[PDB]
Amino acid sequence: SGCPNGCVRPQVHDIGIAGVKYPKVNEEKCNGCGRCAEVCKVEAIDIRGETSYTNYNVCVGCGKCIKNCPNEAREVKEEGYLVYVGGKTGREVVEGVKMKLMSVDEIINFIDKVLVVYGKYAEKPQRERLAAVMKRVGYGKFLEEVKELMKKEIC
Amino acid sequence: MYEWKLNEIVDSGVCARCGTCTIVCPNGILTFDERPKLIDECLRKGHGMCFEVCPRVSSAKYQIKIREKFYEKYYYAKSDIEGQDGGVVTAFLKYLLENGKIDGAIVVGDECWKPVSLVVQNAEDLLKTAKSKYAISTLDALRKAGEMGLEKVAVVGLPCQINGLRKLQYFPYHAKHDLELGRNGKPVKLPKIEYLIGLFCTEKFRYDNMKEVLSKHGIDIEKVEKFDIKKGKLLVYVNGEKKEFDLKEFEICSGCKMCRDFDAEMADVSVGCVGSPDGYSTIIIRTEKGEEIKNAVELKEGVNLEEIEKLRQLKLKRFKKEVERRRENNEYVSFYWTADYGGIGKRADGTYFIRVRAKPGGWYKPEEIKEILDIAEEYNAKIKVTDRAGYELHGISGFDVEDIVLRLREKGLLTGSEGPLVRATLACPGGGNCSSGLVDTTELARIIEDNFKERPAPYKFKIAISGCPNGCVRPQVHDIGIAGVKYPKVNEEKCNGCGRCAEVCKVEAIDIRGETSYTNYNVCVGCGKCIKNCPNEAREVKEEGYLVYVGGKTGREVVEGVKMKLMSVDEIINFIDKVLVVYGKYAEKPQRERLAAVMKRVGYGKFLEEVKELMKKEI
Amino acid sequence: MYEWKLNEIVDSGVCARCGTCTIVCPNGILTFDERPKLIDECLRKGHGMCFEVCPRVSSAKYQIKIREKFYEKYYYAKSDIEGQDGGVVTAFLKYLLENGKIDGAIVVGDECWKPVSLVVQNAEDLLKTAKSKYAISTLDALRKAGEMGLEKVAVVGLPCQINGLRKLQYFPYHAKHDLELGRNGKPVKLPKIEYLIGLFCTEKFRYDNMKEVLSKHGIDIEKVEKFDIKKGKLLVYVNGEKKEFDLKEFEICSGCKMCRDFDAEMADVSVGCVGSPDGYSTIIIRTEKGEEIKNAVELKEGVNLEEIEKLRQLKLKRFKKEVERRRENNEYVSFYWTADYGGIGKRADGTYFIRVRAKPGGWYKPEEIKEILDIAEEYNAKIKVTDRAGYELHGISGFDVEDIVLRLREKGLLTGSEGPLVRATLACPGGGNCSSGLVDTTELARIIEDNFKERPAPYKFKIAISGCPNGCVRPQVHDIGIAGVKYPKVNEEKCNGCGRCAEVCKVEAIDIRGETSYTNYNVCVGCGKCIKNCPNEAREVKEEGYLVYVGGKTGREVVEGVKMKLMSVDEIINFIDKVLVVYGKYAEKPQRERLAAVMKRVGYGKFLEEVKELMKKEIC
Ligand code: SRM
Ligand code: SRM
Ligand SMILES: Cc1cc2nc3c(=O)[nH]c(=O)nc-3n(C[C@H](O)[C@H](O)[C@H](O)COP(=O)(O)OP(=O)(O)OC[C@H]3O[C@@H](n4cnc5c(N)ncnc54)[C@H](O)[C@@H]3O)c2cc1C
Ligand SMILES: Cc1cc2nc3c(=O)[nH]c(=O)nc-3n(C[C@H](O)[C@H](O)[C@H](O)COP(=O)(O)OP(=O)(O)OC[C@H]3O[C@@H](n4cnc5c(N)ncnc54)[C@H](O)[C@@H]3O)c2cc1C
Ligand code: SF4
Ligand code: SF4
Ligand code: SF4
Ligand code: SF4
Ligand code: SF4
Ligand code: SF4
Ligand code: SF4
Ligand code: SF4
Ligand code: SF4
Ligand code: SF4
Ligand code: SF4
Ligand code: SF4
Ligand code: SF4
Ligand code: SF4
Ligand SMILES: O=S([O-])[O-]
Ligand SMILES: O=S([O-])[O-]
Ligand SMILES: [Ca+2]
Ligand SMILES: [Ca+2]
Ligand SMILES: [Ca+2]
Ligand SMILES: [Cl-]
Ligand SMILES: [Cl-]
Ligand SMILES: [Cl-]
């Protein structure tokens, strides 16, 4: 997905990627015009007097408030590709776990390692999806092995 | 030089000079005489409500029309009141005030023929405003009515003014948020616009230009008794004499050349001169509010429909000529009319994309795909396929959007599945196509499309039909999800414990024990594979049909829909309709609240209880 | 008139006249000379951070102390600088300014002995403030330092002022929200208080009262060279003579009679006169910031601890006398000291409830329950049992809260499991008690309680230990959940397909086929019933241990914890500690963000990979 609107459903895919751009407010430029709160679909912004704030427990990193600020008071706090793992749909819905921001090389390494650990622990081909194998061995055990194999990668 | 986003619309000359942008400002820092003007610095630099209500930024006609569901009833009439023609507009306003239908009337008066926006609460004061002012008018009195605290008002306006006021009424559906808050944290004070009376319109002029041109011909504007526009000529009645002037002698406002609306097509009732005899006014009723004019005047049938259509075409030809002239001279063009159609979006590079509403089941005829291919090659547009099995043409110029939509419409390819309405229904091949299909999905998708396609809703509404419990089109995360199911029961006389059924069960719900088999109904998803693949026909259908889910969604957050029950096709159609009615009744924030959010806020029990009550009343 | 919530504290005379409430106002509508005053209408009617920082509304000492982890190191010293005693406070401030430890010093100067709060950025200007002003002082210069844009400052204050400033430092932990926003939508501009230097204190007086009492004795307050308090008398040095006055001659501030803090127990370093020779200052170092005093003055051991404790007891006796007097005369009392203890809450009717931190496994000795029963009958309090297997005594008067807490403490019944800290660990009977128990839960709960009981965190933190996968204590919706698991494997040589194991499986994960049995590991929860109940011993242990979950929560919203892996007891203790460290590092909103919210915001992968990195680094 190019942004957090998840048009291609990154949260219910074996591996989901979503573009994110989190904001930070520059108090010297912000004047409390109130425009950013209008472009926020999740309503994560608070306009108070001559400034603005962001609730980071609600903010999804759509970056609309940075793009649409007429005074350029909103800057990029964090940016990149947010990754999810273990999502699935079909007979049952399983929400993928939010991992972290990853570089393209990290994403390729991560996809490869997840497939290696998935293949190593899968017991029932054509029945067990990644989510089922992750749940059975444990997300912590599964993901810590994925990380160990990622560190070993030299190509 | 106070920065103001709408300056591009005003400086380019695309501005209709309607004055809608200035009456909505919650800080009152905008003024309008013959053009918009900032009297103080805007902290947003005009990035607010003024830009969002502008009918020349975006018409927003598609989203307003599907909700207003305008119709056309042609009549003509005359009243005892002396007016521009039959005095119908004044007679209707007098009736609305007398019968307590409005607290006040927003009308255009004049001082030496210089227009003045007025709030009229007395029927006797209405007569002074009963004549056409061909100089630029404002909507300023609507703001005064708000400061006064008037609850309901009727507004007379030119097509451009009606368009801006319709954008104000349906603000969240196109703006995607609520009215802008001022410095005091409150939105603008405006009365509810109960009636929108539109006038037929060909053009308007600057007051000083009219006065100057009249002065050149030895006429003092202040002495003029009446004005009129007939067959491309301005009639001036002065000192008991009639003077004819060519309209080209006066300087037409640049925005009028960029206008497509002649008869004020979005008004509750439109009043004009064309198509009716002298001394009468043509009347086009389009809504139930406009119908009230039948109590104010005696309606007569026999309107000349061809004369009205000839003017519509002349105005459209003038518009096309102006748009072509701007293109050739590299002048700024705002493609505001692109919002007259569904399935239109703006790309990051400035060009447009046209979305073809996905066909039921993702099945496309060769004739249909060939048309999309021909357009793509002709306009050098990229072809995109959507995850709802729809098509999108990318890289379309604003000059070609309308031509492509109408060309696609002729071949049955309606553009849609965009905005706060029912999106394209997603169905899998299902029964008859897929070997796992248990129910028909193509005909059910066609029935749902025929009953709800492009239906307005507080926000996007997506329906998915699956042929079996594998949910390829995700019924569990759709506003309404349908899944074919076939639950098994074992016939002990025929079952011999061969063990074949347990192998075809992906969820492993079956137990093979000795000479029989069992099913764990807490695991069984009703795929019916064990019934189909039993070599001894020992498994039979226990229960069968369409399993329904409601309140699901995806996007920014995932919400799983609630499993309802098996439903018949008629029940499904009734259910979809009633879920939309209860969703619309309880939604508070259009373009932000999905069905799941409204269901969660009012409660699933309360919401679904009402859906059932409405379903029972249908029958 | 203009309504102000703190008027009850001020009008009753409980007010310490510390001036903390007025410096925090983001609208600057509060001023302080000798008592708080509104110079403009407050839209909140004083329902804001002026009331929330007040040390007389609530001390908030328990939540501040568990975070500051104060200790006590006694020393005495003298410096070259001439001061009230050894001039230690000025020598320390001079050192901090000279070595760039602070941008400025918040000190009390004077004009005719009328105290003046000052911002000092130069050492030469420090000498003018090196002397005790017994008239009411303010903290006004801290607001000036903020307007100046100073980043770090050192503040000298009386115990009451230190208490209010500690409440400002730990604002979110007791206020439950962030600093109040003014009309401009911004919080008060104040510098970071890097050092809090506390003074020993017995009392303070109104300036005009001091001046009038001295004038009546023929002494011009301007002519006075120095003041001093010793042996219940006020020494006045004027014209080369020491003129003694009884402290009763002057009118002690009513708030001083309600004071319990003599040695400024919450300061980074406390400086006083008692317990050290004349010309020296007693020094009590309590934090690593206070330790920096060793570089400013030559510390000497040999402080008379008994003299300091005598003063503490005299101040506490005076406090108890004043509280009893108010009770007998039906005067208003603010039970601000109830926040010195854990497990204290205020009921809807105005009385208090005392929460006994639940004992591990919900097991209570008869002596423990009998003590709770004796207290309930003596004070006519209602006995409540909590869903974490704790006890609560309801209907306690503010006058008896402290007595009950200390009485409970003597019998080993710690009051707690309240506030932003690690709550009582919830464990089921488990192994050895419950027939479904697979692991020991009672000893694990005791180990977790010994290592993390009442540990401060950004918000409440709850741990649950289940003996088997039935999750009686809900491990899947706890910040950290532990569940005993025992997964099976079938021995085909011993299995004969009798079918007994499928009957004991609640999840129906077993398949009986001919002369053997199978297990669906996507359904199996590891209850181990099939191993235990196999009559032919055909089922063996495949995997066994403590299954761990993290990021679970209940309350306003339900959040399911993520299944990690099997962990050893040492691994569990290391994991709980690391999760708390990473939770504290990334938490932005104390008393609002639970672990699950912080994990979701930074990402589960990023959060857990840091927990793992810190776990590998652990050597103890
Ligand atoms: C084209 C498509 C992506 C694709 O590669 O296929 C798409 C494209 C856009 N989506 Fe979408 N969405 C598309 C299917 C989806 C789906 C999946 C579905 O509907 O089958 C989702 C999540 C599923 C759901 O919503 O139930 C989806 C979640 C969104 C959201 C988040 C809405 C929400 O409730 O969270 C937005 C923005 C908004 O509504 O605020 C959005 C908005 C958009 C817009 C129009 C952005 C915008 O606001 O202007 C994107 C147009 C870009 C473009 O060039 O097309 N799009 N979008 C899909 C069009 C299918 C169609 O023909 O209708
Ligand atoms: C006594 C008890 C209920 C009971 O009948 O047993 C209780 C009582 C209160 N809880 Fe609780 N909570 C109690 C267990 C819980 C639990 C379950 C648990 O801890 O096992 C939850 C949800 C589980 C969880 O939080 O993970 C719970 C969720 C809350 C919340 C909302 C928590 C959240 O993050 O959403 C608050 C208020 C807040 O935190 O803002 C709260 C706050 C309170 C307060 C202190 C109200 C307050 O904000 O001051 C209540 C004290 C009233 C009184 O008279 O005791 N209480 N509270 C439980 C004390 C157990 C103990 O000894 O520690
Ligand atoms: C600038 C202009 C151009 C027009 N062009 C055409 C045309 O090309 N073809 C056609 O058939 N009809 C046109 N009309 C409409 C026509 O002139 C009559 O106004 C209409 O038929 C109603 O007549 P009536 O006697 O029923 O109205 P009346 O009873 O006389 O009431 C007239 C109403 O018009 C309103 N009004 C007058 N001037 C303005 C203005 N500038 N802006 C907004 N409201 C105003 C007044 O407030 C009043 O309520 C035009 C009107 C205007 C104002
Ligand atoms: C009102 C009052 C009562 C006291 N009562 C006792 C007591 O009963 N027993 C006891 O042992 N010690 C008491 N002290 C502490 C004692 O007076 C000395 O201030 C302390 O020993 C430090 O002296 P010094 O020479 O080391 O500091 P110095 O080098 O003299 O520095 C003194 C510091 O105290 C600050 N200061 C002075 N007056 C005030 C004030 N009103 N509020 C806040 N800061 C102030 C100055 O700004 C300066 O930074 C009291 C102090 C005060 C102000
Ligand atoms: S749009 Fe920009 S200037 Fe306006 S309130 Fe938001 S961050 Fe501040
Ligand atoms: S980045 Fe998006 S979700 Fe976050 S505060 Fe800005 S507009 Fe809202
Ligand atoms: S305050 Fe709002 S409505 Fe007024 S000019 Fe500015 S952006 Fe436009
Ligand atoms: S077209 Fe109307 S709303 Fe738009 S800028 Fe012009 S006067 Fe304002
Ligand atoms: S021609 Fe169009 S822009 Fe001009 S006044 Fe008429 S409706 Fe408005
Ligand atoms: S949902 Fe079922 S019937 Fe439809 S395509 Fe998928 S497997 Fe086939
Ligand atoms: S495939 Fe048919 S006959 Fe064989 S065990 Fe299953 S239900 Fe019985
Ligand atoms: S209908 Fe499908 S899910 Fe149910 S027992 Fe048969 S094969 Fe399994
Ligand atoms: S504005 Fe806030 S800090 Fe100031 S007096 Fe009012 S409530 Fe207290
Ligand atoms: S004790 Fe201190 S913070 Fe409280 S009201 Fe008095 S001066 Fe203000
Ligand atoms: S005795 Fe000292 S610390 Fe206590 S209130 Fe009085 S001045 Fe403050
Ligand atoms: S979690 Fe298991 S061991 Fe503990 S009480 Fe419940 S059934 Fe018994
Ligand atoms: S109870 Fe033991 S012997 Fe019997 S079927 Fe189960 S594993 Fe085999
Ligand atoms: S360990 Fe428990 S859940 Fe697993 S197969 Fe045995 S009885 Fe069933
Ligand atoms: O436009 S997306 O919501 O289908
Ligand atoms: O008392 S509640 O916060 O556990
Ligand atoms: Ca006419
Ligand atoms: Ca089975
Ligand atoms: Ca002394
Ligand atoms: Cl808009
Ligand atoms: Cl228009
Ligand atoms: Cl205090």
From Swiss-Prot, chain B:
Catalysis: reaction(s): 3 oxidized coenzyme F420-(gamma-L-Glu)(n) + hydrogen sulfide + 3 H2O + 2 H(+) = 3 reduced coenzyme F420-(gamma-L-Glu)(n) + sulfite
Binding site for [4Fe-4S] cluster 3: C495, C498, C501, C505
Enzyme's top EC category: oxidoreductase
Induction field: Induced by sulfite.
Temperature-activity note from the record: Optimum temperature is above 95 degrees Celsius.
Annotated positions binding [4Fe-4S] cluster 1: C15, C18, C21, C25
Residues annotated for [4Fe-4S] cluster 4 binding in this entry: C524, C527, C530, C534
Domain of life: Archaea
GO molecular function, a single term: heme binding
Domain 4Fe-4S ferredoxin-type: 6-35, 486-515, 520-544
Chain sites annotated for binding siroheme: C472
InterPro entries: 4Fe4S_Fe-S-bd, 4Fe4S_Fe_S_CS, Co_F420_Hydgase/DH_bsu_N, FRHB/FDHB/HCAR-like, FrhB_FdhB_C, NiRdtase/SiRdtase_haem-b_fer, Nit/Sulf_reduc_fer-like_dom_sf, NO2/SO3_Rdtase_4Fe4S_dom
UniProt keyword annotations, A-Z: 4Fe-4S, Heme, Iron, Iron-sulfur, Metal-binding, Oxidoreductase, Repeat
Cofactor needs: [4Fe-4S] cluster; siroheme
Activity response to pH changes: Optimum pH is 7.0.
Chain sites annotated for binding [4Fe-4S] cluster 2: C428, C434, C468, C472
Listed EC numbers: 1.8.98.3
Keyword hit for Oxidoreductase: yes
A Pfam family it matches: NIR_SIR_ferr
UniProt family annotation: Belongs to the nitrite and sulfite reductase 4Fe-4S domain family.
Something else known: Expression in Methanococcus maripaludis, a sulfite-sensitive methanogen, leads to sulfite detoxification and use of sulfite as a sole sulfur source by M.maripaludis.
Domain notes: Contains an N-terminal H(2)F420 dehydrogenase domain and a C-terminal dissimilatory-type siroheme sulfite reductase domain.
Function: Catalyzes the reduction of sulfite to sulfide using reduced F420 as the electron source. Involved in sulfite detoxification and assimilation. Cannot use NADH or NADPH.
Protein name: Coenzyme F420-dependent sulfite reductase
Species this protein is from: Methanocaldococcus jannaschii (strain ATCC 43067 / DSM 2661 / JAL-1 / JCM 10045 / NBRC 100440) (Methanococcus jannaschii)
